[PDB]
């Protein structure tokens, strides 16, 4: 039906990952993504939510690292009454966001052991933890995961229990590295340059330099995110009135002179 | 910031439920509200 | 406007109020003050009615065009409590 | 025109102003590399002057000091949650000015969760709320300033790398008071005129070579705070003196 | 009003405080252990035209219920009979007269910054009563020996304190006017003897006076009064003079 | 009458200092080991003070939680209270003209102590619901076992407030230090228990018992005397013959 | 009176000490080891105490929450706060002069001892903002599965809390220490289990089991013995079974 815009690249690994996502799309099982920092695993997860979930299924992007107070993390589970300073109205909504949908998280490494254990004791049985006194709800919610650290690495560290690590990781979706892609990286760079030229509302073509491409190849670019491409496009944007830009700045503090 | 049943703050508001307020709502009686308003304005001295 | 022309918007007699303000008798002045308080109550009632009408119109227009374009068969469910929460007014008042 | 507050005659200052004008035409996140007492919203004032929402001034007010829980509450405020009652989104940072540019300061003290919320703010992201779901999305640009080198903090692992990178779309370096040497006399004269106006002094009676030498020898940590203190001392003294009165300095403690 | 220390530097500071008292500019000065600068400023305000005005001095250490803004504007309506016997509020009492502030070092820094902002804006509002403030009545505060380093350390907002007071009261040295401190001690001893219904002052040995100089009076008048009181109470008689000086009330025997 | 023990010459000087303190209405602090009973001494002094017929406030420190002064100390007799509004008596208000003893005041919150000291020095009630704060002539007393000299230096209490809160603070000599009222207290407790336990008479402390008492370090002081009486309660089973070893330490285990 | 006496010399001495202390109403502390049963011994003593026709109701010490320590100490008078349901029954008020046998005394927090400091005083039940404290002398008694003198050395508890115990701390001998009625206790426990296991009779496991227990540390002094007996009975599930090959090591893992 509707396809989100994606960068064009000759990366058969990306196509295989897409095909695997399509295969797991009819399936309703936990999905784990091995995406590193800046790999845009969130975009892949959303694309899955387009197909893996039922059409127009609820989606929610809550990061456990974003949680401020572990008490609020408890509040992330529904509270009936008598919680916190004001118990007048209580609706966590996260389980409501969970209900009729999937669960997507990023960098699930930082969670406290209790948080992870509660998550296991909720997901595996399907029942919902309630902060206030109430019968738990067996909300049918899928689970999708995307983290940088190796699952065996945490197992050696012991952060995730064997039951928790296993039941958490049913399918593995390795995200290709940006440094892994070279030609597909260049094609996606050109596509992002075109998109940025459209966004900046500049009719003139952006243009590129061979030395700039060589330097970009030299750049580590650990994050395959549009953010690194956006930084490149901003370095281009610092130059104007020339059909093809020359050179670029790695960082604003860099080359301050 | 998760303590329970701590010191109670002084209430700085009241419900103040008045039959005047309910009649003011009039359940959105519309034309009926117009007729009631006319009747009151007739009963109200120095009105209109 | 929800028949703003048909809305009464009646007001008390300013000339009679001035006469009541100029009343020599203290009891007559107190009666005039009570009448003025009643008139202020009526004005508050009318203003509240108008404000509720405007807020309800805004809340309906938040989704009415979507329902009108989508069609009768394409009508999304509507909750009175949800509408009141969106308007932030009392749910019983909206009902 | 925003009264052209803190008119910096420095060529580097002019280039920074032009860059800020370019950024204000844009509506994307931008980083302001500032220092304590330097560029205290003066660049933000220029940005508001050149803001796309020129008619509708942005919230600005980047400077803020609060506790960790307090900053988190400033991020997310719900009427039922927390101690305060009947006030949801009490900070209302995005509610302060629709669109415009969200302005932040002292991001170093922000927690890892706070930094993550900041990162989600940098990209297209939903509002923060203690309870319920916040599908409400208010588009608004991002501006921020801290006095530290966040590259070290990321290297030290004290802030989110993604937040540091995405926020650092284009870092706006700032010059400190020590950077301003030739324009210092002009800033002093402008502050003297402003003080004479505010203190009802007839005019700037004049400076002294000893006063200028002392001001130069002064550390002057603040770009304008040192100037402000010097101006206040000179206004208080010369208002009665009606003369340069050598150098008038302000010290928190006085002995003999 | 009452007898006070009269050190030369203290005399100059008192003259400056009296000169500033006619102006209704806000007052906020750091305070020593003996302090007394606040009392001097109060006497100056009594001398100035600000006299006969309200002198509400709130030691900002106790917060009741929400307080904060509710503390600032204590007129709260609702959950009551519909009429309040006396709910003017801190701002209203501050309006029309001198507004002294105490216990401010431990008061919330946010509370202080909000009060300083209201010092110009005056955006007072509350359910029981609201007012645009801007009463222009003079304000006073007790910084309580606040360190500017703490503002540099960030414990308190530097701008919040700077906008509050453009000027402050200096602290005279405790060493100054040591002989007059003996006179103040004698006056306090006479006052206590009248309070204790003592017959008369039996006198003091010069050695005890020299020992008092050695103690250096770390609490200044505050320490001196306590030391004199302890000496009189331990004396327990007015037959002969006292030649014993106790540096501290804590002692071993 | 109410006073007990005091046979020591240091205790005599303490009684003289109490007589001196009676002239001054200013509050003071009583210092002594656990079980000192200096609180009872202060209460007897207050009875012998100017208000011969007056109230007294026990007012233990760790009895008010999450409550300001106007909840239990000052009270909320006025209306406009949080939520429901009603009359509510206050201990500090009700005790005016009497005695307001603080039981273990050293173990009180530091900021709350600072606020209380600021209120006391000013002498204004403040609070809410009242037209006039006025002043209270209640006798402010305190008695504990901790040593403030170290806690104040550690920041456990406000130094300036402690200096203001301190006027005629005195430390009683240890009961173990006196080592004289041993026999007197032993006889008094023996009589009290024999009356209580309905015993015919006191069996008496033998020479071994006296030697053990003399050698006793007596960390509990008067509380150690109470412990000795409790041990003699076991010796009450031996009321027929003189008690050989009345002294006992509960920490040690028999057989 | 529904407690099986140890029927041993040390047990008989403990029962005698309990009977001697039974008329005494002063505070008590129990230093019996794990699995002592003083929860039942003190109850039987209260049944045989002076206030035999008295309302005796114990309560758990560490069970009280951190937020409402004052509420546990005494019910708030409801003059203030959202509460509008008069005064809750205070701990001393709930006791009403009866037995309030303190369990889990060792695990209390510092604020608990701080409240007990006031509780040391006779009666004086002061609610939240109440008129005047009420004197309620209730039989006080404690127990400590941990070592109270060791705690005092660590300083976790208060010295006054140590002073709270008015009588000697009765201590139960270890199961290894007594080992006297182990056979008879095992027989009674086996009979009780067989009645519970719906078996009219069953050969008890005592052949070499006494020797094994003599070789056993038996930390679960009263509990684990009967627990193992019942476990072995359930595993065997047969009456015509000799008293052999019966053992319980639930923590250990069989091959
Ligand atoms: N194949 C692709 N085509 C276009 N954009 C991509 C692609 N992969 C990643 N991105 C971009 O990377 C950005 C961030 O990616 P990602 O790292 O998945 O987000 P997160 O930081 O939440 O993990 C997204 O805005 C997305 O547009
Ligand atoms: N100049 C003075 N004359 C008379 N008494 C003084 C003088 N200075 C200080 N005192 C006494 O010392 C005490 C200091 O009290 P205060 O000013 O409240 O101290 P602080 O402000 O440091 O808390 C006062 O009670 C006052 O009686
Ligand atoms: N003056 C005294 N004479 C005799 N016994 C005393 C005296 N003072 C206290 N006691 C005894 O010591 C104990 C008093 O302890 P308490 O009043 O709690 O002391 P504290 O001052 O440490 O609170 C009681 O056993 C009491 O009989
Ligand atoms: N004399 C006894 N006869 C029978 N059972 C006993 C006896 N003493 C203790 N018990 C058993 O001990 C258990 C109580 O545990 P207890 O020893 O009170 O733990 P604690 O001493 O740590 O409070 C009860 O189930 C009871 O059956
Ligand atoms: Mg992400
Ligand atoms: Mg003071
Ligand atoms: Mg037990």
Residue numbers in the entry:
A (entry chain 5): 2 to 258
B (entry chain M): 1 to 48
C (entry chain M): 288 to 382
D (entry chain 6): 3 to 258
E (entry chain 1): 6 to 258
F (entry chain 2), G (entry chain 3): 5 to 259
What text comes from the article?
Bacteria use sigma (σ) factors to recruit RNA polymerase (RNAP) to promoter regions of genes that need to be transcribed, with 60% bacteria containing at least one specialized σ factor, σ54, responsible for transcribing many stress response genes. The σ54-mediated transcription initiation requires specific AAA+ proteins (ATPases Associated with diverse cellular Activities) known as bacterial enhancer-binding proteins (bEBPs). DNA looping enables bEBP hexamers to engage and actively remodel the RNAP-σ54-DNA closed complex to convert it into an open complex. In this work we capture intermediate states of bEBPs in facilitating DNA opening and partial unfolding of σ54, and therefore link the ATPase activity to DNA opening and σ54 remodeling, which eventually lead to transcription activation.
